């Protein structure tokens with residue numbers, strides 16, 4: 844945001860699972876499109892933890 | 906590796922692989938590759954990375 848170091852941190856952090864922050868995001872929720880979680884953190888949710896839209900598919904991403 | 910060059914690298918990685926202008930905004934189903942912005946996704950019927958036939962172009966939130 845406010846500096847190149849903060850901008851760098853944001854782009855590094857945005858790759859990581861929003862729940863555990865320990866593993867890259869590896870799932871996109873259909874239909875809402877949120878890139879939220881690694882594969883393990885996506886196992887327990889049936890609604891998106893950001894927008895609460897019912898998940899119809901947990902699509903693997905790379 | 907300077908902060909500025911690391912940042913440039915991560916910013917470039919987010920760019921659509923077709924136009925290299927807008928950021929990636931689509932996930933291809935079923936292969937799951939992040940390749941294109943919304944506009945460029947209209948031009949492809951197969952994933953440019955793995956050539957799998959695309960069944961759905963899911964918008965990233």
Ligand SMILES: [Ca+2]
Pocket residue numbers: 863864865
């Ligand atoms: Ca941790």
Ligand SMILES: [Zn+2]
Pocket residue numbers: 860861862863864865866880881882883884885
């Ligand atoms: Zn996780």
Ligand SMILES: [Zn+2]
Pocket residue numbers: 872875876877891892893894895896966
């Ligand atoms: Zn969502």
Ligand SMILES: [Zn+2]
Pocket residue numbers: 921922923924925926927941942943944945946
């Ligand atoms: Zn594009």
Ligand SMILES: [Zn+2]
Pocket residue numbers: 933936937938952953954955956957
């Ligand atoms: Zn692909």
